[PDB]
Design a protein around this ligand. Structure first.
Ligand SMILES: CC1(C)CCC(C)(C)c2cc3c(cc21)CC[C@]1(CCc2cc(C(=O)O)ccc2O1)O3
Ligand SMILES: CC1(C)CCC(C)(C)c2cc3c(cc21)CC[C@]1(CCc2cc(C(=O)O)ccc2O1)O3
Lengths: 212, 10, 212, 10
């Protein structure tokens, strides 16, 4: 089964110019993200090749959702795992204001307004991790079955913790399209920074951007 | 992908 | 309220080289899409400026979901509203094989395997239409409230029509991230065809691609 | 956006 307790432990086990600071922190969190994934139930039992495919497919959305939830109490800014607050004025003045505002409006503010807890965040990240549409998986059905168990557990958790909010489970799932769209746009920026070549991109972040 | 394989092997 | 009956009537009221054929059909369906949206409850009561913002924001995903569901009984291909079947061999041999296979694998096949009915399709399209994250809406809350009513109705409909499938409501919502990703990639292709300039793009399709 | 406005006006 897929108990939300274990998913919550995985989140708590990994708790801690602007473009350069964000790219450096991203490389640091990629190491932490592997440790998180190995604590998600049944992920390590998957074929090694598929664990790679899932992490290469979801790392961007997984880590974007992480810092978004970490930034709840931050006003008009985000909090990186290194402890650095990046304010939206800094992002605008570095040329990435539009996508930064998208994170604040579509992700951080929505997480703040509903008070998304760390169990719901973990389940949402687990759903993203267990992405059955990832190309090249040796068995898409197994990953789809794992995703179904996660959101069967998360719905039951929502209905128990927040009985007064019937649409809350659906509200959580309906932030994934925004997360998908924002992840893709952030990838486009990274590839541009790489192309220009004056932004420090460390080895692990660089490996995520290379071809399969 | 050297790094990801090595960390998942542990 | 947001009765699924009315949403279903909206779908039934509008029922009917490859890149050129698809772009021509897209322009034709844009006219039909306006008529569909005006039959969705409370959409026409929104401010005119917001009806424009919602349609300019969602037209691609709305029409991609339409032809995807229309292509259920089609094997290895899609069925355009003009009655033309586009087979995946034609798409590959025209240079758009990868995104075409994404539609078949992530959308058409998933709709086929679960036998998504036209009521669930309409509700999914209504959710996409009522996108509260659309930039520039004069009142995002009103659009969000309309989206909540749609998926409150769709969940209750799923639990009544298919009591034996508890995760079906969630399964429907979890196709929206793929639809979001595929819509964006299709937009990238359109802008490339426009840039090259030898693909016929008619006036309505062209207007969707122009700046706000 | 001429066309969309004109069709939504009906
Ligand atoms: C600079 C740019 C393009 C614009 C601003 C935003 C915030 C959208 C952003 C975000 C952005 C990336 C780039 C950008 C690269 C990938 C990535 C992935 C998520 C992430 C999390 C943390 C953390 O958990 O500490 C640190 C860094 C990090 O980097 O996220
Ligand atoms: C050629 C290309 C890039 C690759 C193949 C696919 C199918 C992905 C595609 C799809 C694709 C568009 C382009 C492409 C443009 C926008 C659009 C929007 C949805 C749509 C629906 C119908 C219908 O309901 O009849 C007809 C056309 C139509 O056009 O959808």
């Amino acid at each position: 089964d897929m108990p939300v307790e274990r998913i919550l432990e995985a989140e708590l086990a990994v708790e801690p110019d602007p473009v350069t600071n964000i790219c450096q922190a991203a490389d640091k969190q990629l190491f932490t993200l592997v440790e998180w994934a190995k604590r998600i139930p049944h992920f390590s039992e998957l074929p090694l090749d598929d664990q790679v495919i899932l992490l290469r497919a979801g790392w961007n959305e997984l880590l974007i959702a992480s810092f978004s939830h970490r930034s709840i109490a931050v006003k008009d800014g985000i909090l990186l795992a290194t402890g650095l607050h990046v304010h939206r004025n800094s992002a605008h003045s570095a040329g990435v204001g539009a996508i930064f505002d998208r994170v604040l409006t579509e992700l951080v503010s929505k997480m703040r307004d509903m008070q998304m807890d760390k169990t719901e965040l973990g389940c949402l990240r687990a759903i993203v991790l267990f992405n059955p549409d990832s190309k090249g998986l040796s068995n898409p059905a197994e990953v789809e079955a794992l995703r179904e168990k996660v959101y069967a557990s998360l719905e039951a958790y929502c209905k128990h913790k927040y009985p007064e909010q019937p649409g809350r489970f659906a509200k959580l799932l309906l932030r994934l399209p925004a997360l998908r769209s924002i992840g893709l746009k952030c990838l486009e920026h990274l590839f541009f920074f790489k192309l220009i070549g004056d932004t420090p991109i460390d080895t692990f972040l660089m490996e995520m951007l290379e071809a399969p | 992908h050297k790094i990801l394989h090595r960390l998942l092997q542990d």
